Amino acid sequence: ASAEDAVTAKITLKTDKASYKPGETVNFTADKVFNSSLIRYTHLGKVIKEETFSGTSWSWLPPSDDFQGYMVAIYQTNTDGTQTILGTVGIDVSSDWAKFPRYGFLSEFGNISESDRAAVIDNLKDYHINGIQFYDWQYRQHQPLAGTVSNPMPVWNDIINREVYGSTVSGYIAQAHSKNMKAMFYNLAYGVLNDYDPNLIKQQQFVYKDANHNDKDKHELGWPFISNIYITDPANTAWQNYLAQKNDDVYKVYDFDGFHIDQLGDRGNVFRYDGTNADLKNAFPSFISAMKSANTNKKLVMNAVNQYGQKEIAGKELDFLYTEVWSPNEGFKDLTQVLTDNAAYSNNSKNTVLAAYMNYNKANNQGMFNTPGVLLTDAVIFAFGGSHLELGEHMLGKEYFPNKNLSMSAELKSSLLEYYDFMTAYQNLLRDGGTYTNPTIATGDGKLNLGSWPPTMGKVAAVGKQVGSREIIHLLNFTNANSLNWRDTDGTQNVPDLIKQAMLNLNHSGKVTKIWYASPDYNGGAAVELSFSQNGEKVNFKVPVLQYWAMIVVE
């Protein structure tokens, strides 16, 4: 009758910041304390420090090598002589977010108390969120700063005519900063609302539906939005110069680290004023470079909406890659294609964040997220070196971030923390170089019915990655899957039955010295060294538990 693993954890173990620069001290908080307990600090399965669990609050200076993930696990020796993991936390030592981005958002900037904002940022911190997209903070797409640099409006009305407080924006930036997170301001690349100044943005800058500059292209918005959004040509230099100035104004008032560039995606066949093809995917590269040039110390990320623009922008000055995923990219195998493709487009230079809104249909109404839906999709994304923008004040159910129709159960919260712990702790193995492989792995007891990736409903999918001298094997469990659509749009996906103590046979040519297992579903993701035999090319071992996602590491 065991509860889910995350939920069984006797201790909640937390750290003060989301991430740490080399040389910065990690301060831990445990919610409760147990006798006869030892803290193990691990790097890639290896214990690098042991110390007595001696109280609720203590510090650790991590090794200074940059871009390293660690797992911290606390072990109690029970009176029978068995050991229990009480709790675990992952730690990212990164000088900068761009290598291993864990992106979240914020969506409400009105009169929210400091203590309320604090609780929001603290929560994100515990997911190790290392940067935040500030969504619909801006006054206007064509003028994101309300007021002047000299005299910034303290209170402005947003695109749905709600109040935004300068102090709330500044406050959240400061709070994210205090947790080692980056703050990225949302705007479109090319957005104009109907109150823009026609002396500053001229007819010649707009994108049109026809070749005779008759009808302007636009994002149609109903109530409560104040305006439809007109579209300019991102390659037009006057627009680039205009928005560069708007950006500087923002940066002079609000200490954003950079600009989240949004777009509306493929607009079909649309034209410049002169009747020429606006071909927007090939306009974005010049736009990115102009924006970077105008503020070289400020970060840029740009959303390739369903991969529109991705190939064209992947070699520009973007911190990492971002894809909002839509039809027909609805299969699990389509998420991994997007990740494979982004690697290729960036020549293996940039990792990806996926904006991939879960339980999308369900979210038309108040409800709960379907926990197994969310977990299985993040198991796939994380196993394949992806990252998921999904968490702010609430978890995203729609492309309109303020939509908060769906809530997360306490069970999902607990589990998802272990998932973010997992993908932080083991980032070096998930998305830090190496080549995908196709391991020859077989059940030795018939408890598992194994296939390769991409997955089949009814089967455990095995996929491998060669990372340095290590062979990694991910098991992702579709045994009980009733759909291979990642979005679980109606919240129908099944919880996988636990498989326990499952014999595996693996062909591995080289000598094996150590095999270890880690699963976010087992012991908080703590690395567990496995017994094994090796006979020529043939390694045998047993995995303790597969539910959604287990990782086996052969050294």
Ligand X SMILES: OC[C@H]1O[C@@H](O)[C@H](O)[C@@H](O)[C@@H]1O
Ligand Y SMILES: OC[C@H]1O[C@H](OC[C@H]2O[C@H](O)[C@H](O)[C@@H](O)[C@@H]2O)[C@H](O)[C@@H](O)[C@@H]1O
Interface residues with ligand Y (CB under 6 A)?
136, 141, 159, 188, 191, 219, 221, 229, 262, 398-400
Pick out residues in 430-459 that bind ligand X (CB under 6 A): none
Pick out residues in 1-30 that bind ligand X (CB under 6 A): 25
Looking at 275-326, which runs of residues are DSSP E strands? 299-305, 321-324
36/54 with CB nearer ligand X? 54
- Give the separation between CA 314 and CA 316, rounded to whole angstroms: 6
Stretch that binds ligand X, among 57-65, 190-198, 256-264, 266-274 (CB under 6 A): 57-65
221/450 with CB nearer ligand Y? 221
75/401 with CB nearer ligand Y? 401
Residue type (1 letter), 42 = T
Q: Which does 71 bind (CB under 5 to 8 A by kind): Na ion, ligand X, ligand Y, none?
A: none
Rounded to 10 degrees, what is the CA torsion of 381, 382, 384, 386? 70
- Give the separation between CA 347 and CA 342, rounded to whole angstroms: 8
Residues contacting 320, CB < 8 A, separation 6+: 98, 99, 101, 301, 350, 351, 352, 353
Q: Which does 48 bind (CB under 5 to 8 A by kind): ligand X, ligand Y, Na ion, none?
A: none
Give the DSSP per-residue string, 420-459: HHHHHHTHHHHSSS-EEE---EEESSSS--EEESSP-TTS
3/61 with CB nearer ligand X? 61
Residue type (1 letter), 523 = N
20/308 with CB nearer ligand X? 20
Kindly state the smallest distance separating residue 219's Cβ from ligand Y, in Å. 5
Cβ atoms of 413 and 127 within 8 Å: the answer is: no
- Binding-site size for Na ion (CB under 5 A) equals 5
Residue 92 makes contact with Na ion by CB under 5 A: yes
- Give the separation between CA 462 and CA 439, rounded to whole angstroms: 7
Phi and psi (nearest 5°) for 121?
-70, -35
CA distances to 108, 349, 506, 536 from 437, rounded to whole Å, are 44, 20, 13, 20
Cβ atoms of 303 and 261 within 8 Å: the answer is: yes
- Binding-site size for ligand X (CB under 6 A) equals 4
CA distances to 154, 187, 391, 480 from 110, rounded to whole Å, are 11, 18, 19, 44
Both tokens of 288, joined, read 């990115």
Which one of residues 97, 105, 208, 422 is an interface residue with Na ion (CB under 5 A)? 97
130/336 with CB nearer Na ion? 130
Which one of residues 76, 130, 138, 205 is an interface residue with Na ion (CB under 5 A)? 130
Pick out residues in 359-418 that bind ligand X (CB under 6 A): none
Residue 532 makes contact with ligand X by CB under 6 A: no
Which one of residues 3, 47, 61, 149 is an interface residue with ligand X (CB under 6 A)? 61
Q: Which does 61 bind (CB under 5 to 8 A by kind): ligand Y, ligand X, Na ion, none?
A: ligand X
- Give the separation between CA 386 and CA 46, rounded to whole angstroms: 24
Which one of residues 4, 12, 14, 60 is an interface residue with ligand X (CB under 6 A)? 60
85/389 with CB nearer Na ion? 389
> How far does CA 130 lie from the centroid of its chain?
9
Phi-psi region of 359 (alpha: psi -120 to 50; beta: other; left: phi over 0): left
Q: Which does 19 bind (CB under 5 to 8 A by kind): Na ion, ligand Y, ligand X, none?
A: Na ion
Kindly state the smallest distance separating residue 17's Cβ from ligand X, in Å. 14
Name the residue number minimizing CB distance to ligand Y: 400
Stretch that binds Na ion, among 78-86, 122-130, 283-291, 450-458 (CB under 5 A): 122-130
Kindly state the smallest distance separating residue 94's Cβ from Na ion, in Å. 3
Kindly state the smallest distance separating residue 333's Cβ from ligand Y, in Å. 26
Q: Which does 60 bind (CB under 5 to 8 A by kind): ligand Y, Na ion, ligand X, none?
A: ligand X
Pick out residues in 329-348 that bind ligand X (CB under 6 A): none
Q: Which does 159 bind (CB under 5 to 8 A by kind): ligand Y, Na ion, ligand X, none?
A: ligand Y
> How far does CA 334 lie from the centroid of its chain?
17
Both tokens of 484, joined, read 């291979």
Q: Which does 136 bind (CB under 5 to 8 A by kind): Na ion, ligand X, ligand Y, none?
A: ligand Y
Stretch that binds ligand X, among 56-64, 361-369, 436-444, 477-485 (CB under 6 A): 56-64
Site string for Na ion, 1-20 (x = CB under 5 A): ------------------x-
Phi and psi (nearest 5°) for 141?
-55, -35
Q: Which does 188 bind (CB under 5 to 8 A by kind): Na ion, ligand Y, ligand X, none?
A: ligand Y
Kindly state the smallest distance separating residue 25's Cβ from ligand X, in Å. 5
CA distances to 76, 389, 421, 427 from 70, rounded to whole Å, are 20, 22, 9, 9
Q: Which helix (H) or strand (E) holds 249?
A: helix 237-253
Kindly state the smallest distance separating residue 26's Cβ from ligand X, in Å. 8
Kindly state the smallest distance separating residue 130's Cβ from Na ion, in Å. 4
Q: Which helix (H) or strand (E) holds 167?
A: helix 166-178
- Give the separation between CA 381 and CA 353, rounded to whole angstroms: 9
Q: Which does 94 bind (CB under 5 to 8 A by kind): ligand X, ligand Y, Na ion, none?
A: Na ion
Residues contacting 481, CB < 8 A, separation 6+: 376, 455, 457, 458, 493, 494, 496
| Other Cβ atoms closer than 10 A to 126 | 18
Residue 59 makes contact with ligand X by CB under 6 A: yes
Binding site for ligand X (CB under 6 A): 25, 59-61
Report the interface residues with Na ion, using CB under 5 A. Answer: 19, 92, 94, 97, 130
